[PDB]
């Protein structure tokens, strides 16, 4: 949600009110960035329905067309299914990195049969 944008705006009043010395040094700039970055992060969807129900029911037909499974063919057949549905192809590659950790967790826990 965007509401934190108002909150982070409130943060700036503490910083500016502290010095009020009408002087800027580069040292205060580098040190400030490191503190904020670590603290802040810790403190229908097409992806959510394809993996759990579609891929379970999709592998029956795909196996009759392909004799084996290849990492090269995985992205090739997926593109033809979602042609002209999303005008954003660059974001697909981001899905590649995430699912690899997801799918390996599913094998030991047997969540997808």
């Amino acid at each position: 949600t965007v509401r934190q944008l108002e909150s982070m705006i409130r943060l700036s009043e503490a910083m500016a009110r502290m010095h009020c010395c009408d002087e800027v040094q580069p040292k205060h700039v580098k040190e400030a960035f490191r503190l904020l970055n670590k603290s802040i992060i810790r403190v229908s969807e097409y992806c959510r329905i394809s993996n759990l129900i579609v891929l379970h029911l999709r592998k029956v037909e795909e196996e009759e067309d392909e004799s084996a499974l290849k990492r090269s063919e995985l992205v090739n057949w997926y593109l033809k299914e979602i042609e002209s549905e999303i005008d954003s192809e660059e974001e697909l590659i981001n899905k590649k990195r995430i699912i690899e950790k997801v799918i390996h967790r599913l094998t030991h826990y047997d969540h997808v049969l």
């Binding site: 949600t1 944008l5 759990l52 002209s84």
Partner: protein
């Protein structure tokens, strides 16, 4: 102790209600109208009818009230309730029984401003194209020539999207926020409380009555109590209380444009089960929504980028640093434009939509209801009211198509991507369909010469 000139509206009559207390009755009266300056809550009037104006008062009379406010507080015996801050007994003495408008009107007919008018309709957040259509229809709000509009939004309360309806009161003349349970006095719903020995039972006056031939705005519709739903279910169907037993007859007017927004229960579509087939609720209440719009696109940082900068720029203006002309343009128009109909062209108008219905009956089993169409016909009505150009442009035709496609998404499983590709990519009820074949609404048009005699 001075004669006072003021104005007011009679809201309701107490004929339907059942010896010291019997001499008088109780009525709910307001004086302050909806305005930006009227934002601070005023003191409500409670008038008392001493058996003089009973049955002689009818809703919808813009009348003026004049009199003297004597504080002859009859409750000196301390056996009743009391009046608000304006502590005075209010007697009734006047009820009738039977300009910048012109300068703006000159600019209203002008076509130079008539071109950019639909490109500035939604400047606050720029929203979505469907929402503007609903807002424009609501602004105009358009014998038995009536109708209701169900505008649906799909977001979440934390985002100001839920609060987007708050901006309407700047333009709307009558907006009251219910917030659900515990609204201001009567929240359009009737309720009964236990009263002491000598007090008057309460006749519930909703904002429905106060906006007769007006517009009433409802917020957080799905957060109301289950008990309120039972009472309101019947009234909403007829927008009144009608009894045809020929023994007891009464009518209470409620003719505002019901504007409300539904709130999704929990997550949007996180559960994997059916949305329509997994509801324990009653069918007729849910089916009051004419359009079921679904949100388009999920992650669009570029679109989300604009809104953030608006917030940042907005906060700049408010900090210290050392146009009513446009508001009334749309509102005033809905009162003056009343075109007429051509007898030889009435069939052609209705002919076009009838073709679209019969197309859906080829592959299916009555899967389309006329009721959804019933709203679509009244929606096109505002188009002629705005331009008066006698035709509809193909630019608007594409936009109205997007309305229907969203509805099919929510009700059908995501497998809609296989059967409806071509549309997307590119016996009482039976008798009603018969009328569309001849394009005659009146079922008593045979020998209408004898109806005039009566």
């Amino acid at each position: 102790n001075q004669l006072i000139r003021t104005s007011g509206v009679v809201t309701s009559c107490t004929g339907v209600l059942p010896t010291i207390y019997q001499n008088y009755q109780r009525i709910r009266i307001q004086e302050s109208p909806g305005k930006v300056a009227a934002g601070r809550l005023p003191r409500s009037k409670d008038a008392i009818l001493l058996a003089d104006l009973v049955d002689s008062c009818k809703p919808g009379d813009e009348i003026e009230l004049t009199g003297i406010y004597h504080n002859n507080y009859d409750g000196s015996l301390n056996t009743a309730n009391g009046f608000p801050v304006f502590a005075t007994v209010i007697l009734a003495n006047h009820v009738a029984k039977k300009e910048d408008v012109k300068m703006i009107t000159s600019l209203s007919k002008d076509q130079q401003i008539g071109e950019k008018i639909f490109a500035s309709i939604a400047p606050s957040i720029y929203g979505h194209e469907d929402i503007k259509r609903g807002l424009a229809l609501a602004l105009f709000g358009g014998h038995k020539v009536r109708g209701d509009i169900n505008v649906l939004l799909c977001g979440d309360p934390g985002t100001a999207k839920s609060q987007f309806l708050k901006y309407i009161e700047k333009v709307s003349s009558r907006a009251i926020f219910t917030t659900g349970q515990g609204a201001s006095a009567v929240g359009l719903t009737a309720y009964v409380q236990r009263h002491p020995v000598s007090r008057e039972w309460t006749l519930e006056a909703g904002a429905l009555v106060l906006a007769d031939r007006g517009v009433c705005l409802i917020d957080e519709f799905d957060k109301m109590n289950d008990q309120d739903r039972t009472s309101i279910h019947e009234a909403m169907e007829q927008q009144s209380i009608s009894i045809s037993k020929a023994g007891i007859v009464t009518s209470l007017q409620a003719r505002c444009t019901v504007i409300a927004a539904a709130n999704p229960i929990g997550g949007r579509y996180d559960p994997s089960l059916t949305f329509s087939e997994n509801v324990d609720l009653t069918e007729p209440i849910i089916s009051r929504f004419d359009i079921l719009c679904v949100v388009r696109d999920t992650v669009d940082p570029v679109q989300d980028e604009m809104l953030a900068r608006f917030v940042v720029g907005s906060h700049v203006r408010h900090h210290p640093s050392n146009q009513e002309v446009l508001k009334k343009y749309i509102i005033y128009a809905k009162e003056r434009v009343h075109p007429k109909l051509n007898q030889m062209d009435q069939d052609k108008v209705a002919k076009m939509y009838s073709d679209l219905r019969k197309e859906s009956m080829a592959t299916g089993s009555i899967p389309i209801t006329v009721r959804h169409i019933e709203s679509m016909i009244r929606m096109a009505e505002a188009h002629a009211r705005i331009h008066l150009r006698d035709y509809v442009i193909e630019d608007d035709v594409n936009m109205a198509i997007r309305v229907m496609l969203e509805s099919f998404i929510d009700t059908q499983k995501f497998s809609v991507m296989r059967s409806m590709r071509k549309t997307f990519a590119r016996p009482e009820k039976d008798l009603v369909d018969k009328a569309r074949q001849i394009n005659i609404h009146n079922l008593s048009a045979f020998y209408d010469s004898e109806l005039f005699r009566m």
